[PDB]
Write a structure and sequence with these properties.
The protein is of the alpha+beta class. The chain folds into two domains: about 325 residues, Cupin (Jelly Rolls), CATH 2.60.120.650; about 130 residues, no CATH class. The protein is about 30% helix and about 20% strand. It is built from twelve helices and 19 strands. Helix 10 crosses helix 11. The protein binds chloride ion, manganese (II) ion (MN) and zinc ion (2 copies). One zinc ion binds next to loops. Interacts with FOXG1B, PAX9, MYC, MYCN and RB1. Interacts with HDAC1, HDAC4, HDAC5 and HDAC7. Interacts (via PHD-type 1 zinc finger) with histone H3 unmodified at 'Lys-4'; the interaction is inhibited when histone H3 is methylated at 'Arg-2' or 'Lys-4'. It comes from Homo sapiens (Human).
Length: about 450
């Protein structure tokens, strides 16, 4: 009747020993948590990173949010004090209650009532921005003089500034600019402010820490059910699935988990409270809303487990004509070029992906040669701005190779779309390539040597 809450997602309480290495721990829980898409992690009781900031000197510009189920939203001045004041009064006036007295069950039930009710037009506000000098990480960072307590947490793997640049992560090695993806984002919530159903770019992981305040309610769907969910959503809201001109135009929406559950899409929930982590796994759809005034911090990351999925994601982007945040192949080759300093399990896993890359590239080059492309020239793709090396047809970011024609200066197609560049015969085309196959096999060999050492 009305709202039936989804079953709870897994909750882990690691020992200090398990907690010592976040990537080992994530690998450990993966068999369980990937079945549910999201999971919650409670740190050991004494892991307590100090939060300190001036509520009057932290400023941000809030985003306005209408709360209508199935309505399209785009994916991407208050002080913290004045926002908090607004947020508390909003919740307090909404329920005619003190905020700590409003049961989380009630806020959840009411959220799903108000987004589905046409006659209600509740609007709320929220903050979402990357860490900057005007608004920095909630975790300790080096800058000016820090307390010993802050020093304790400076190097923690669970300090979300460090997570991107550890010895078992992959996004670290990327030299290309992916700031929107590798830097933590800060989120200031209020009652009912929400995040629409989405998956992370390049099907990466994400990890979210609620620094303080009232809980954040989550819904998650396991990666295996991603296409099921999309099919449900495309039937109910086809507008969200029209082609989009860039990454700054991704359309997303609020949708009741019971609707998914009715269509046999598995959905899990949780209330993330202050001091708790939520982890989302590759291609796991998630959404949620805040219970009240709060402050969270989140970052994307990629494990070695993720590498094959990363490759599959870019393939999927190609099929959908979606823009890439970075070139997956460029990242693989960057790591190969640093094989000697790579962690050994990383080296072994990159070697396997590189082997697929090379064999695919071989087949593509044979195919375009048979189409009559004969001329070729080496090209350092990584030097081109992204918007100068996207395939005309499928928008993929080129790196291994592309086709050009003097007919249309500056334009490129990837080797899947040789026929989509221009009307000139293929003998007028050039194969532009980053590496010969003969360059590539020794690169892969270096990884092998590092891996077997
Ligand atoms: Cl509404
Ligand atoms: Mn997310
Ligand atoms: Zn293409
Ligand atoms: Zn041409």
């Amino acid at each position: 009747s009305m709202f039936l809450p989804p079953p709870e997602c897994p909750v882990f309480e690691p020992s200090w020993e398990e907690f010592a290495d976040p990537f080992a721990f994530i690998h450990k829980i993966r068999p369980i948590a990937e079945q549910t898409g999201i999971c919650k992690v409670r740190p050991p009781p004494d892991w307590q990173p100090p939060f300190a900031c001036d509520v009057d000197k932290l400023h941000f510009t809030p985003r306005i949010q209408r709360l209508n189920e199935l309505e399209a939203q785009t994916r991407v001045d208050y002080t913290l004090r004045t926002f908090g004041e607004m947020a508390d009064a909003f919740k307090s006036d909404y329920f005619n209650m003190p905020v700590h007295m409003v049961p989380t069950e009630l806020v959840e039930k009411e959220f799903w009532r108000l987004v589905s009710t046409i006659e209600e037009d509740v609007t709320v506000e929220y903050g979402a921005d990357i860490a900057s000098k005007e608004f920095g990480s909630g975790f300790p960072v080096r800058d000016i003089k820090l307390s010993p307590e802050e020093e304790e947490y400076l190097d923690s793997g669970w300090n979300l500034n460090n997570m991107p640049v550890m010895e078992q992560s992959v996004l670290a090695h990327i030299t290309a600019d992916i700031c929107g993806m590798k830097l933590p984002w800060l989120y200031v919530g209020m009652c009912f402010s929400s995040f629409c159903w989405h998956i992370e770019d390049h099907w990466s992981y994400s990890i979210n820490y609620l620094h303080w305040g009232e809980p954040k309610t989550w819904y998650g769907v396991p990666g295996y059910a991603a296409e099921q969910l999309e099919n449900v959503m495309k039937k109910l809201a086809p507008e969200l699935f029209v082609s989009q001109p860039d990454l700054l135009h991704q359309l997303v929406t609020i949708m009741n988990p019971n609707t998914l559950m009715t269509h046999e899409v598995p959905v899990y929930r949780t209330n993330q409270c202050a001091g708790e982590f939520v982890i989302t796994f590759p291609r796991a759809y998630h959404s949620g809303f805040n219970q009240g005034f709060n402050f969270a911090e989140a970052v994307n990351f990629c494990t070695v487990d993720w590498l094959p999925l990363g490759r599959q994601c870019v393939e999927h982007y190609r099929l959908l004509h979606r823009y890439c945040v970075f070139s997956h192949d460029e990242m693989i080759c960057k790591m190969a070029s640093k094989a000697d300093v790579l962690d050994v399990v990383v080296a072994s896993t990159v070697q396997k992906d590189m082997a697929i890359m090379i064999e695919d590239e071989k087949a593509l080059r044979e195919t375009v040669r048979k189409l009559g492309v004969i001329d070729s020239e080496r090209m350092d793709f990584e030097l081109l701005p992204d918007d100068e090396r996207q395939c005309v047809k499928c928008k993929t970011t080129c790196f291994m190779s592309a086709i050009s024609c003097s007919c249309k200066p500056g334009l490129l197609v990837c080797l899947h779309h040789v026929k989509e560049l221009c009307s000139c015969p293929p003998y007028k085309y050039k194969l532009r390539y980053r590496y010969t196959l003969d360059d590539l096999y020794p690169m892969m060999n270096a990884l092998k040597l590092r891996a077997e050492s």
